[PDB]
Each structure stands twice: as structure tokens, then as C-alpha cells.
């Protein structure tokens, strides 16, 4: 069997496909409505949830692009933000496209602050969203917080126009300091080592758990295949998570493989303990215990 | 901008449940994607018959169909999964070179063969996953015009990315042409647009556009410039019946005029058995040329 056929394991896991549905609707909107909608969502979410500050290295990497926009006159600033949302082919859009998700997020965090302050052209006063756009924002505001932040993440990542620029890799947590997870029902060493090395930012140890051709599938994305690609993903995108697995189930699979599904919560360093996303992991392990495939799913509700 | 013009009549109520539903579909495991379509196809076929693919189309897909028919059953199932997964294989590359009609004709013939048992069918008694059953429920709840647009997009999105299309039909003889009538709208450019498209007269039709003008099909990005728009007309827009009903005409910036028309459109795949609810949004420059036209599938007849 293939990586792609393995996507079908635990086929009855209830993934939150309202998230990609909602991003698809969002993507249909006119660019100015896209930007206003996110401005509205950001302002209202900010009443009860504060975004962590972007890292210093991140801000340094986005600094030249931010300066360029801040130096523009107001009509030109608005046009540059529209170019990003439209995925137009421009130098700024190409630069944005070369960035990891964290750098893109930190770029918009800083523009958000500047718009609140009046230093970068704000959404026009009294702006009203289009018919479709107001419905999309209603949908977003009805979602669990973990689903809301995932919609915003995808909206930010999808902007710009397609060299890879990412933050420096943090040193792994010192061995003495590491905590170990406990999962009801699951003593599988590979699963436990996966969770514990990821919580420690120990990506060189983590990648060693994979088969050479192994894949990792993030929520709502295609599998990332092979150790080179999966390690790059870990280093660019997977730093400083907190995985909090709760319970699991272990079953035999074809050809002497084992499949394990674990559910629990995950926190992103952008929100710390203020947002706990509901997550399932679905592992397919070969006979030696190596990870041939792991999918990470955002779940439809805690009921999942 | 072309992109800023996407915002005209911003309050037109597009059926964004269609791209939402496509996004959810696209998350599914490949075998569930194929079974789901098989199920929708079978149930829709009890009240709607798909027109036969044209002879030229069938000839163009003939070699790929023969190759699949020659495979043993496990390999046929694998080939159809490769298509649904967008895997990189020769068959997937060939499929991706085809226009939508050729892809549709390829699946129409495989559908007939699966019904007959000559090509590996969906396993007897197959049950969809949790997410997949919800996706199919959504589809079955949509208007028929929205259902067929979902199936069209699912078919078009398969394969892996030379352009192969059916031959262009000769324009309808002029003595035989009918003329549309639109309540409220006597604009010659809008009327010539509808009438030339209904006559398959793409050379005359393209002449209504500005050099840099664009056409935006339902839920797709603008197709920009006369070369690209004419190619689109010739590959994809043959044998439609546009039945505009009424419209509204307003001034726009820089001496332009914007016109929105609503009505129905029939595709030759279903003839008069499916009438899709459609809006056209035109932006015409001061000389009457089309700078931008968007074609939208509407959320319900209540948007007409
Ligand atoms: C745009 C824009 C604006 C600013 C918007 C801003 C500023 C938005 C900031 C949003 C952010 C900060 C969202 C962050 C979301 C983070 C998420 C959702 C992280 C989820 C990570 C998970 C689920 C990881 C799971 C994993 C697991 C557990 C594994 O086992 C393997 C690895 C991996 C798969 C990664 C303003 C307002 C100016 C208006 C104009 C336009
Ligand atoms: C896959 C598959 C299977 C077969 C599926 C098949 C066989 C499905 C066939 C579906 C079809 C046949 C759908 C056809 C849909 C056509 C549509 C929705 C056309 C809409 C056209 C419009 C709206 C045009 C509007 C335009 C206007 C008015 C303009 O003014 C400008 C041009 C344009 C924009 C084009 C089986 C079962 C084996 C199971 C395994 C997988």
C-alpha cells in the first residue's frame, strides 16, 4: 500500500472540515473584503485572546518589507496589501511567498499594530462587508477558538505569489528539563518518543523515528514525504509546540504494520495555554516500529 | 485593476457553498472520493441523464481508456485512485492535459463500464467515512445546478500538472440566430455578448473585449487578455444556452459603466433538464468594450 492509501486509516475520525470549507469561501471574496474581514475578526478576537509577540529574528527578517510599506503613501499601502491578498505577481508578493508561516504572521501582526495606531492605511471608517463576506465572518465567529485561529493562519499563509526564509532553529530542550507525556491505553515507544521529542524541539531525534520514505500530514494539507522534507517542515514550522495527548487506541494493520490513533490537545506558541486545539494523531508504524505515515487532524469538536 | 473590479455589485449572493463543498470533498481519502461520486452519479441518474460525450472527445480519450480497461482489477482501482490523489504518473499527466469536456467524457465511459462490471467497480456494500457521508449529504441538498458544478470541479481537479481540446464547432449560420431580450437592458455590448456566445461565434465575441480585458468564470480567478479568453471560449464554452432575464445599469469610475444581469444558463451536458441560476457582472469602458465580466452561480433562485 501507498502513503496516499494510508490517508484512509481511522476513516471515521471526525475532522473539522468546516475549516477548509470556510477558507475556500473566504478565498472567493474581493481582496478589500478579505482584508476588512480579517481586520474585523482580529479586532473582536483580540478582546479576549492576545497574540504572542513575534520573535526578534522573525521581525528582523520581515523588517525591510515592512519599512517599504510604511514608506508608501496611503493609497499605495492599501494597494500593496490588496496585492498580497490577490496573490498578484509583484516583488513584495514574491518576497512574502518566500517566508515561513511565522514570518508572514509576524509581518501582519506589525501591520495590525500600525493600522490600530493610524500609521498605515487602515480599513476605511464605517466599512461594510459584502453579502458573502458577512456570512463568512459569521461562520468564523461561530467556530471553536482553535478552528478560528487555523482559519486565520491559512488565510495569512495563502497570500503572496509563488528560496525559503525561516527563523533560526532553537536548541533542543536540555535532557534533564524534559517532561514525558502519558497516554491512556498507549505505551507504544515510537508514539511516546514522537510526542516527547517534539515537545523538546528535538527534531534530529524525532526524524529518526521515520521510515526513509515516511510522511507526515499536517491538518488539511497533503502529506509531506521523505525525511528531508519532513525534517525541513519540523525546523521551519514546528518549534515550541506543546502536545498534550490524552488517550489512544492501537490496532493491527496490513503487512504486519500497526495503526494507532491518539487524541488530545495542542497549544501553539502564538497563544500559549489560551487556545487548546482538539487534535487527533493517526500513526501507521511498520513492523520495526518506524513511522511510515502520521496524520495530524484538527477535530470537529471536543465530542470528537 | 482587474482584481479591484472583482468587487463590483459586491452584494451579489454567490453560491459559495459550491467551493466550500469542493474543499471538503478534496480532503477525503481517494477511495471515498471515488465512491462518493459513484453514489452521487447513480442517484442523480435516476432523474437526470447526462448527454453522451462527443465523438471527437471520445477519440481523444480512447487510448487512456483502453489502457485502463486492459489492466487487471486491482491496477484499475489504483489508476483511478492516482487520478483522485493527483499523483504524478503518465496517465495523470495525460488527464491533466485534457479540457474539462474530455475529462468528463473519460469518466462518463468508465461509469458505464463500472455499471456493466467490465472495469473494477466500487466494492459491494461500501460505506463512506464520517466526513464523506456528510459531504454527500451536503451535495444532495443543493440545487441541481450546484450539484453538477460540484461534480464538474471534482472531475477537473483530478490528475497531475500541452493542451488537448475538442475541435471548434463552426458558428451558427446568421439567418438561424435568435436574439436575447433582457428587461431593463438595451446595452449593445451586453446583448452582443449573449447573442454571440449563444451562436458559438467566438471571433466576434472576443472583439467586444478590451485588449487587457478579463473574464471570470464561477469560482475561478480572472482569465486575462484576449489570447487567454479566446482560448477559454474555444476549449470550454461551446454549445451553451444563455437565457438572461433582467438587469440593472449604473455608472462606474472613470466614465465606465457597470451592468449586472441575472438569468439562467444551460450546459449541453444536461440541455434543458438543468437551468443554473447565473449573474453576469460587466464593467464596460467609455467606448463600450468589456474590461471585465464575471459570471457567478447564484446561491438560490432568490438571488435572481
Ligand atoms: C492578515 C491581516 C491582519 C493580521 C492578521 C493576524 C496578525 C493574524 C494572526 C493569526 C495567528 C497568530 C494565528 C496562529 C495560528 C497557529 C496555529 C493554528 C498553529 C497550529 C499548530 C498545530 C495544530 C501544530 C500541530 C502539529 C502537530 C501537533 C504534530 O504532531 C506535528 C507538527 C504539526 C502538524 C505542526 C490584519 C489584522 C492586520 C488585517 C489585514 C490582514
Ligand atoms: C468522476 C467519477 C465518475 C463519473 C462522474 C461523471 C461522469 C460526472 C459528470 C458530470 C458532468 C457531466 C457535469 C457537467 C457540468 C457542467 C457545468 C456545471 C457547466 C456549467 C457552465 C456554465 C455555468 C458556463 C457559464 C459561462 C457563461 C454563461 C458565460 O457567459 C461565459 C462562459 C462561461 C463562464 C463558461 C464515476 C461515476 C465513474 C465514479 C468515479 C469517479
Swiss-Prot record, chain A:
Pfam families: Carot_N, NTF2. The keyword NADP does not apply. Binds 1 carotenoid molecule per subunit (3'-hydroxyechinenone is the physiological carotenoid, echinenone (70%), 3'-hydroxyechinenone (16%) or zeaxanthin (14%) were all detected in overexpressed, crystallized protein), makes contacts with both domains of the whole protein. Upon RCP generation the carotenoid translocates 12 Angstroms into the N-terminal domain, altering its binding and photochemical properties. Induction: Transcribed from its own promoter, it may also be cotranscribed with downstream frp. It is found in: Cellular thylakoid membrane. Keywords: Antenna complex, Chromophore, Membrane, Photoreceptor protein, Phycobilisome, Receptor, Sensory transduction, Thylakoid. This is Orange carotenoid-binding protein.
Amino acid at each position: 500500500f501507498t502513503i496516499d492509501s494510508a490517508r484512509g486509516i481511522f476513516p471515521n475520525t471526525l475532522a473539522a472540515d468546516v475549516v477548509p470549507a470556510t477558507i475556500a469561501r473566504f478565498s472567493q471574496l474581493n481582496a478589500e473584503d478579505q482584508l476588512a474581514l480579517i481586520w474585523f475578526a482580529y479586532l473582536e478576537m483580540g478582546k479576549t485572546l492576545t497574540i504572542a509577540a513575534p520573535g526578534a529574528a522573525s521581525m528582523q527578517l520581515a523588517e525591510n518589507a515592512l519599512k517599504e510599506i510604511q514608506a508608501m503613501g496611503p493609497l499605495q499601502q492599501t494597494q500593496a496589501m490588496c496585492d498580497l491578498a490577490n496573490r498578484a505577481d509583484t516583488p513584495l508578493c514574491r518576497t512574502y511567498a518566500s517566508w515561513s508561516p511565522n514570518i508572514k504572521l509576524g509581518f501582519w501582526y506589525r501591520l495590525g499594530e500600525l493600522m490600530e495606531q493610524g500609521f498605515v492605511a487602515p480599513i476605511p471608517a464605517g466599512y461594510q462587508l459584502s453579502a458573502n463576506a458577512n456570512a463568512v465572518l459569521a461562520t468564523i465567529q461561530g467556530l471553536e477558538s482553535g478552528q478560528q485561529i487555523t482559519v486565520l493562519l491559512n488565510a495569512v499563509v495563502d497570500m503572496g505569489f509563488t528560496k525559503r526564509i525561516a527563523e533560526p532553529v532553537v536548541p533542543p530542550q536540555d535532557t534533564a528539563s524534559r517532561t514525558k507525556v502519558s497516554i491512556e491505553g498507549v505505551t507504544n515507544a515510537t508514539v511516546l518518543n514522537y510526542m516527547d521529542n517534539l515537545n523538546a524541539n528535538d527534531f534530529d531525534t524525532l526524524i529518526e523515528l521515520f521510515t526513509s520514505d515516511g510522511a507526515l500530514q499536517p491538518p488539511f494539507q497533503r502529506p509531506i514525504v521523505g525525511k528531508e522534507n519532513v525534517l525541513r517542515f519540523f525546523r521551519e514550522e514546528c518549534q515550541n509546540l506543546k502536545l498534550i495527548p490524552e488517550r489512544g487506541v492501537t490496532e493491527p494493520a496490513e503487512d504486519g504494520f500497526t495503526q494507532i490513533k491518539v487524541t488530545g490537545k495542542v497549544q501553539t506558541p502564538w497563544f500559549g495555554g489560551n487556545v487548546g486545539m482538539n487534535i487527533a494523531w493517526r500513526f501507521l508504524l511498520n513492523p520495526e516500529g518506524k513511522i511510515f505515515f502520521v496524520a495530524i487532524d484538527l477535530l470537529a469538536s471536543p465530542k470528537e
